[PDB]
From a paper:
Copper-containing nitrous oxide reductase catalyzes a 2-electron reduction of the green-house gas N2O to yield N2. MnN2OR forms the typical head-to-tail homodimer, with the N-terminal, seven-bladed β-propeller domain of one monomer in close contact with the C-terminal cupredoxin domain of the other.
Hypothesizing that many reported discrepancies in the structural data may be due to radiation damage during data collection, we determined the structure of anoxically isolated Marinobacter nauticus N2OR from diffraction data obtained with low-intensity X-rays from an in-house rotating anode generator and an image plate detector. Diffraction data from a plate-like single crystal of MnN2OR were collected using Cu Kα radiation (λ = 1.5418 Å) on a rotating anode X-ray generator with a mar345dtb image plate detector at a temperature of 100 K. The crystal belonged to the triclinic space group P1 and diffracted beyond the detector edge at the minimal possible crystal-to-detector distance, yielding data to 1.5 Å resolution with a mean I/σ(I) of 2.6 in the highest resolution shell. The two N2OR dimers of the asymmetric unit indeed differed in the conformation of residue H579, which was a ligand to CuA1 in the A protomer of both dimers (IN conformation), but rotated toward S546 in protomer B (OUT-conformation). While the environment of CuA2 changed only with respect to C618, the missing H579 now caused CuA1 to move almost fully into the plane of C614, C618, and M625, so that the coordination geometry became trigonal planar, while the environment of CuA2 remained trigonal pyramidal. Contrary to the IN- and OUT-conformations of the CuA sites, the four individual observations of CuZ were indistinguishable in the low-dose structure, where CuZ consistently was a [4Cu: 2S] site, with a largely symmetric Cu2S2 diamond core that is reminiscent of CuA. In the present analysis of MnN2OR, the Ca2+ site was fully defined and showed a typical coordination environment that in essence was octahedral but included two bidentate ligands, E260 and D274.
Author numbering:
A (entry chain B), B (entry chain A): 63 to 634
Write the structure that this text describes.
């Protein structure tokens, strides 16, 4: 449970940042934050959102200073984590990101078309992560062009992204809406919860139906229809769209009470578990019955093998790989341990006890996550419970309180609280991976894709980034290329005109690990990271005439304070 | 050392974020981050830098997405922390911020005129914090208007800000430059290091002189000259400027080797200690000799009562209140405990031993900070050492590594490492305060200054913020006022035209602690916090015609997912 100085954590944890927009890398079981990976936020330090390279990745037709990331998931090969990529949603500005786990940096951002608010996200497990599966939460008109605002004619879609290219593969129109999603251990099926079968905005409307549903997607049938050309398109997007509304070959709508929320696949591949939320239950769907259901051989509700009452406000379920499930009860403010097989007996009227233990948590739990739960190798060691209120649990810090991520030992029969982890607004889910499932680089190589655009521009200017310190004049544009070797930039002054569009490229020629440099231009609103063997750039408009200093903002050497230069801006 | 679940930390720590731009609130000795206070960064979650209230506080004539904050200090009454305000510098875009410690929010940002790169910052101690003292690091022409770029005619200034108004009080022109600063325990004196007596840009130039100096400011004389009207002004600023160059009544330039860096006041009020950096020394200046020096009764170097050799790269010194000092050695990667009285005897020629202990730290230490060191109540319990490299100390996370903030027990004769704390780029200094020295509010009062502007606009529109759900049209502006009680906004639909300038005001009517609401407009790049009894607002341009959902992004209730609404944008 404890990590001494000089000792390493046993697992990485990748935490969502919620509306703060980043991913946080923790060591488990120390629960210490090792790194922040900027995604949808703008990072003053590394310049994510400021650098040209990050801006290229972000794309889009407007700058967004925010995002809302909930659901981080790591790429799999044959149902085991492979450590290549992390993917996460953006509910705020309707995007999905991919993070490269070799350098812990975002490398792709995709805008999802003709939907709003990407919420649920999880990955194909088997045969490997070929698809990223994405829910859009909020129904909108199709197309959304202002000619018809009616809810009556508003819909959402389920989206599959090609994991390797990050281009959207296809979308499925559904009835109702989409909340959370998971995938099976064959590649054939994915499934999502719906809380708004009513397609309402008002609170009473969203709660009218006694049951909403889990919608199950026959990914095999969908992919085949898309391959055959049996699809349509919406609006300005060329993405293939198939229609899963009503009675469709692509979907099954299994009724589940009530405004259900989490959707979690058991690590033995047997079950999708929908969390009942307004219903004090979960609903256990037998994946091995879905083939029969897609042939209309059984009823929709025949796939339900258990629907146990657990307590008030079930939100999310996770697994120890020993046959138990752990479910957050938001209103009762507990985590409930229960046995799946015993709940199945109870549903059948063989009235065994199925609840093993309720542990109070502090306070109001959202997601929970057991170590390796999303893989075949679910190890039953650690359980993280991510609670949304902290009240009195930490020192007072004003009206805005931290969240509380609690680490619980589930290695034995009895859940035991070990650590209370204050966290800034606002983690949703997290994912734990063994140390040995991640392989990182300690320095860049000069062909790295993270500065492909810099190499391409340098070639146009005949600049050798590893060697040159040059000022290139291009009309109202100026490109400044500098090398850096601690504690010196290879250029200590340059001159431009007021209003010039200045781009500064810095290449870090240091080879020693951890010798990162920075670059900041005083009063010009720019900063960037340049780690060993990286190139990075920033663009800014030169301000009113005068001297402006630049300096290294990454303490790098005893002579760091002296690592700088001057930009001289002349009257045009 | 250890804080169990349900127990509280004994100290607050306020960490600088460096070029990440925020202040981080830690519990000590657990070393867990309790809260982030946005300052110069743009926070996707709370909307700091997006909300109208934060934008008014930031002011300026352009948006900055970045800052570089090093030096957090808390307001004092008679040399004891009083818990009212924290102040911090911005090196990147030449600002100073004040944080209100009742709500843990920035409330004032001041742009410092006619200087670049605010670095050193510390507070008046006695009789209380009336002044904030600020160093500007980089010499610039006066005025900085592009007519003369020469270093020969470039200078910097020391700045005093009125702590209560946050308006600049006066500035002092100096020779050389300014790095770090501290104040005495009378109010009369402040002092700064200089590393660039050469006023050079090139590295060899900045290290040419064997000695630079500590510049001591006679604050009493300066304030008198200003009150008498004996000052000038620079450029377009009305701030009073006095000239402390050369032989001046306002300054004394005590030679100190070599490119000295930290400047630290001992808690008995006896010494200013300059950290030698390129010289393996510190220089101990006796404050009780300064009156004699300002009457020319002693020589400049007669104020030096010790100049002990400690080791390679001394950067920052801190104090246990027992007569020992603790100095970071950046090159040797150690913290050195030494006895001040013995160093004075050694300087006098006595055959004595002033070094007590060298502890290896991991790796390359910058600032260090002992609990209550900046006050009379320096308690000698804890020492934080903030190191700039972490190498192998934490799990690998790519080319960019965390920093390492180490917690050391200094309560006894032997310094003992207790904890290694990974931190994101890049803390400089921190300040520790007892739990009982901070008094926070849990909910807002409706007269709070943090939404005075919202109140004034509501009044003009005839709106009662605590009761109204109204849409106000004013040309092409739309002001939308809503109340909120989780899980329902008081308005679930509103209509605007494409291109309208839409301002949404939300007033949180929940009264229970920790029931924070949020607000996000999908695809419009806005988010904001609304904590209990707060009002907050965001402004955005309505996009292309269509439906856009808004939702609460602060998990607030079991029905959080249903806390939404729609903005309907029509073609103009
Ligand atoms: Cu490069 Cu500090
Ligand atoms: Cu309001 Cu969640
Ligand atoms: Ca419903
Ligand atoms: Ca919360
Ligand atoms: Ca010098
Ligand atoms: Ca570092
Ligand atoms: Cl889920
Ligand atoms: Cl200092
Ligand atoms: Na099959
Ligand atoms: Na089958
Ligand atoms: Na099969």
């Amino acid at each position: 449970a404890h990590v001494a100085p000089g000792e390493l954590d046993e697992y990485y944890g990748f935490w969502s940042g919620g509306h703060q927009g980043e991913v946080r890398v923790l060591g488990v079981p120390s629960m210490r934050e090792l790194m922040r990976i900027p995604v949808f936020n703008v990072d003053s330090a590394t310049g994510w959102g400021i650098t040209n390279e990050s801006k290229e990745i972000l794309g889009g037709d407007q700058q967004y200073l925010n995002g809302d990331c909930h659901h981080p998931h790591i790429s799999m090969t044959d149902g085991r984590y492979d450590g290549k990529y992390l993917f996460i949603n953006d509910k705020a500005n309707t995007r999905v990101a991919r993070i490269r786990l070799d350098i812990m940096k975002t490398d792709k951002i995709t805008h999802i078309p003709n939907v709003q608010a990407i919420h649920g996200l999880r990955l194909q497990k088997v045969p490997k992560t070929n698809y990223v599966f994405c829910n859009a939460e909020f129904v909108i008109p199709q197309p959304n062009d202002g000619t018809d605002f009616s809810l009556d004619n508003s819909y959402t879609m389920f989206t599959a992204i090609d994991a390797e290219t990050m281009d959207v593969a296809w979308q499925v129109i559904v009835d109702g809406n989409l909340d959370n999603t998971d995938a099976d251990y064959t590649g054939k099926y994915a499934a999502s919860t719906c809380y708004n079968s009513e397609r309402a905005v008002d609170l009473a409307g969203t709660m009218r139906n006694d049951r909403d549903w889990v919608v199950v997607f026959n990914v095999e049938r969908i992919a085949a229809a898309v391959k055959a050309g049996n699809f349509k398109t919406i609006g300005d997007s060329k993405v293939p769209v198939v229609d899963g509304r009503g009675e469709s070959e692509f979907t099954r709508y299994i009724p589940v009470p009530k405004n259900p929320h989490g959707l979690n696949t058991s690590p033995d591949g047997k079950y999708f578990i929908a969390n009942g939320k307004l219903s004090p239950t979960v609903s256990v769907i037998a994946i091995d019955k879905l083939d029969d259901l897609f042939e209309d051989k059984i009823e929709l509700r025949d796939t339900i093998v258990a629907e146990p009452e657990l307590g008030l406000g079930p939100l999310h379920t996770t697994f120890d790989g020993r046959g138990n499930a752990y479910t957050t009860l938001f209103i009762d403010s507990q985590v409930c341990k229960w046995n799946i097989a015993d709940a199945i007996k109870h549903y059948n009227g063989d009235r065994v006890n199925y609840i093993r233990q309720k542990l109070d948590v502090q306070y109001q739990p959202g997601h929970n996550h057991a170590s390796l739960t999303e893989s075949r190798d679910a190890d039953g060691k650690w359980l993280v419970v991510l609670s949304k209120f902290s009240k009195d649990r930490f020192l007072p810090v004003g009206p805005l309180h931290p969240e509380n991520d609690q680490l619980i030992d589930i290695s034995g029969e009895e859940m035991k609280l070990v650590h209370d982890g204050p966290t800034y607004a606002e983690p949703h889910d997290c994912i734990l991976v063994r140390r040995d499932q991640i392989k990182t680089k300690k320095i860049y190589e000069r062909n790295d894709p993270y500065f492909a655009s810099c190499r391409a521009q340098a070639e146009k200017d005949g600049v050798t980034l590893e060697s040159d310190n040059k000022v290139i004049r291009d009309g109202n544009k100026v490109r400044v290329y500098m090398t850096s070797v601690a504690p010196q930039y290879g250029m200590t002054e340059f001159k431009v005109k007021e209003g010039d569009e200045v781009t500064v490229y810095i290449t870090n020629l240091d080879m020693v690990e951890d010798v990162t440099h920075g670059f900041c231009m005083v009063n010009h609103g720019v900063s960037m990271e340049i780690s060993p063997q990286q190139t990075a750039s920033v663009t800014f408009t030169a301000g009113k005439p005068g001297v402006y200093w630049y300096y290294c903002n990454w303490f790098c050497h005893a002579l760091h304070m002296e690592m700088g230069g001057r930009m001289l801006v002349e009257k045009a």
